[PDB]
Design a protein around this nucleic acid. Structure first.
Lengths: 44, 272, 93
RNA sequence: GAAGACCAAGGGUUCCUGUCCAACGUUAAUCGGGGCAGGGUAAGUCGACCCCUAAGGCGAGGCCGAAAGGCGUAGUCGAUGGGAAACGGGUUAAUAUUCCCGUACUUCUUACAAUUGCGAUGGGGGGACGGAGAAGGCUAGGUGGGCCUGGCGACGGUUGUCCAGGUUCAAGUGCGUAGGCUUGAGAGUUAGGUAAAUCCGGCUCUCUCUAAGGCUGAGACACGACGUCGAGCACCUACGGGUGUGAAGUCAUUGAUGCCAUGCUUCCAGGAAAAGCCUCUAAGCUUCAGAUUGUAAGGAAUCGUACCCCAAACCGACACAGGUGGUCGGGUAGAGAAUACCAAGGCGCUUGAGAGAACUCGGGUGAAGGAACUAGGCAAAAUGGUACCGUAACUUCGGGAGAAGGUACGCUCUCGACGGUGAAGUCCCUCGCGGAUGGAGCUAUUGAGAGUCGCAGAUACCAGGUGGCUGCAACUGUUUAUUAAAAACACAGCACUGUGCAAAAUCGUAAGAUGACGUAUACGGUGUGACGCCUGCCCGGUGCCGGAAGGUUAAUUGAU
């Protein structure tokens, strides 16, 4: 049965990637939040 | 011509086709084609702003001379052509200086016919004069609302306006709606009616034929749930349970929505 | 224009390997571990200058480093760029 | 037509080798996609990068918005599309169109020579494209003959009309064929292509106009290739190898869903864009610089390249009966990519061994009966092919219809009738990849008669049950992912209604959008729902439309 995760790298990057996060105010808020939390991985 | 399809299948039984032999079978005139992507009735927000639009065949936009300001120089109809972007057919005209263009093909006009624009242009089909230079009573099409702007009124297959009166810098036209309106006499109009009047005699015959024209199906309000439409809801078939309204509550069946006021001075009689 | 400093940084070490040995014996090809930045032109220059040989061809690949577990902490080894350098016939290194 | 072989994605060392067997592995494990160590991915030509753009994203200024921001111009990104170029063989434990051998091709830079108007962000052209259908021509592949090598039979027979195996090779270059498209040639000219143009478009004169020139072009043929491959032998054992040397290598037939073909015909729903590319000039440069053609010399980087991909490596928590795009598709039978049995190749599904109770599951058969079962023939059983014969009501004249229901069907022989291909030879040549002409050979189709075996010849697998009456919905479609597929939705058709274009309507505070590069034969909303016959009465209510006289009535005003 087709399950929900049908990964493509390009779609992962364009949605959740660093340059995508950095493009928007609220994305930067996420990166800053994760950077404050101490998260090793800021982006996907 | 009008051809009824023989009922060799359901889906063909009730097809009536307009088949014009005079239309050019080959490819259109490439210099006057532009790309014409479809929007599925979505706007710049990506939202469906107009329902029931989607799909259909890829077609190039043909660039029509609705302005018709190439005065003096006669032009001969090379061929009539199917235009996917409108109901009327388009004529490919050749100017004596070797410019080609597309015009809306008037009723009785066929390959070989000569069309001309300007004040001197003879009062024959396909010719474009300023409406001040067009005799009262004459039928015209591709009528300009603003001088120089290009024809906007009477462009649909079989359409035409009649010049009813001329007083000063305005002529009164009667549009196919039945509305009488003033238009500035300086504005151009082309003599005679748009061709392809048989367009209205076609019968698509089947669901898919509408889908080929990029129209998606229309669900009635009465078979939705109340959250979806004011006519939603009920047990069993209902009539909506209320005065007919649009999906957004707007009264249908009579409620007039014209609110211009800027342009009311130009409207002489309404279509009613 | 490859400087001598560049030439002295490009070749990191010879590569010792059954495959490397075969290459040398059979196809007169010396396999080096070159710097990651090294380009086939820089590698040819370096091999010519530092070994006084005439190079026919340079083929390069990068081997991506192995992940290793090392008890609790996983970690990757470093990527190595190797250069298969074919000497012209008669030349020995 | 996969449980084989590849590729993309996705994963990420799972690949190969040595070693280990605790845990992992539904058992054990010497084994492993497990642990540990080492090794392994070689490119001008594949892909990325790159040039180009689609949807769309972002967007200098801009427009708009309390702020945040939104929208959007010029731009700039964005493939799933366009744009240069490599094949055959060999080689590793593990890569190979990447290494090697053989033999190619593309493109750029520099220098030089000879010709020489060069020049774009602009003009024109080109690139450049739909669905369906069909005929033709090919090729791969198949099959047979011939050829070469080997064989001469575990049990009767097997020197043959016998058996088995083999019978290799491309890009590229030349050539320019089947097929496809297009009249050419020379003058003179110009209301056009934002300016220019020698280019394109237009006009005029002659000439030619089944033609013959050009363009395109599968495949053939030659070269590539006296190379390579090749059964077989020689030859070392370490017993694994290694090298060495190697026969024949043709013809016919069949024939793709591959190629000619981005073709041709036809249809309506009318079929990307942009660049590379060709050409034209402009500004600008004119011993120049540039351009063209040639000849040398040099370059063509960088990143990916292992491995898995009908999966124990991806998505499903699992070594999970699920899901996962593309390519390739041999033999016999067959319409076939169905089905059966096989090939190449790959597997026996990571607990086994016994036993032969009930009962459960999945199957086989069944006396007599035959729906009496049951809510209900649920399930089973049955039908099942081809050719011919024959086929009712009804009908919108298409249907209904495969209605229904019959007959034949294997094999052997005899007499027949025929299709395709086309050798030699012959003859014209406008002498070549050319025409007739000819029928050898090869291969296919089919009729009739006679016979013969069996319970049975569509023998297996495969493969409609049918008919009668009736409700509902015209019909093909759609739907409650995971208890509802329907009479529900849609639908063509119908009607009302809005909407005159800065349209109505919708998204949005706005700008701006869609509507539509549309214009009343259009667009939106509402209902009805093919088609036929029709669609009555009521305008009190409530809508909506119209009317304005009067009455009532807000802000406002401010008399008293």
């Amino acid at each position: 049965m087709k399950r929900t995760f049908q990964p493509t790298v390009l779609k992962r990057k364009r949605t959740h990637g660093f340059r995508a996060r950095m493009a928007t105010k609220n994305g930067r808020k996420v990166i800053n939040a994760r950077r404050a939390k101490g998260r090793a991985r800021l982006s996907k | 011509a009008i051809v009824k399809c023989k009922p060799t299948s359901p889906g063909r039984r009730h097809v009536v086709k307009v088949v014009n032999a005079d239309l050019h079978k080959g490819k259109p005139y490439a210099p006057l084609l532009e790309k014409n992507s479809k929007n599925g009735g979505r706007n710049n927000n990506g939202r469906i702003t107009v329902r029931h639009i989607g799909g259909g065949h890829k077609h190039h936009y043909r660039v029509i001379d609705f302005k018709r300001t190439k005065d003096g120089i006669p032009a001969t109809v090379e061929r009539l052509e199917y235009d996917p972007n409108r109901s009327a057919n388009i004529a490919l005209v050749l100017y004596k200086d070797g410019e080609r263009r597309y015009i809306l093909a008037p009723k009785g006009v066929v390959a070989g016919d000569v069309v001309q624009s300007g004040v001197d242009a003879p009062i024959k089909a396909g010719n474009t004069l300023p409406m001040r230079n067009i005799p009262v009573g004459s039928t015209v099409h591709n009528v300009e609302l603003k001088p120089g702007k290009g024809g906007q009124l009477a462009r649909s297959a079989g359409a035409y306006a009649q010049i009813v009166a001329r007083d000063g810098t305005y002529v009164t036209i009667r549009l196919r709606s039945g509305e009488m309106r003033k238009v500035l006499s300086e504005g151009r109009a082309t003599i005679g009616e748009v061709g392809n009047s048989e367009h209205m005699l076609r019968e698509l015959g089947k669901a898919g034929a509408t889908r080929w024209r990029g129209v998606r199906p229309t669900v009635r309000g009465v078979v939705m749930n109340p959250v979806d439409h004011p006519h939603g809801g009920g047990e069993g078939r209902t009539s909506g349970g209320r005065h007919p309204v649009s999906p957004w509550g707007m009264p249908t069946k009579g409620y007039k929505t014209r609110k211009n006021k800027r342009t009311d001075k130009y409207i002489v009689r309404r279509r009613n | 224009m490859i400087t001598e400093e560049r030439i002295l940084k490009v070749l990191r070490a010879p590569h010792i390997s059954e495959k490397a040995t075969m290459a040398a014996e059979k196809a007169n090809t010396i396999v080096f571990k070159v710097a990651k930045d090294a380009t086939k032109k820089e590698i040819k220059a370096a091999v010519e200058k530092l070994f006084e040989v005439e190079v026919k061809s340079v083929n390069t690949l990068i081997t991506k480093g192995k992940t290793k577990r090392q008890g609790l902490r996983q970690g990757r080894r470093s990527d190595v760029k190797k250069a298969y350098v074919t000497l012209k016939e008669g030349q020995d290194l």
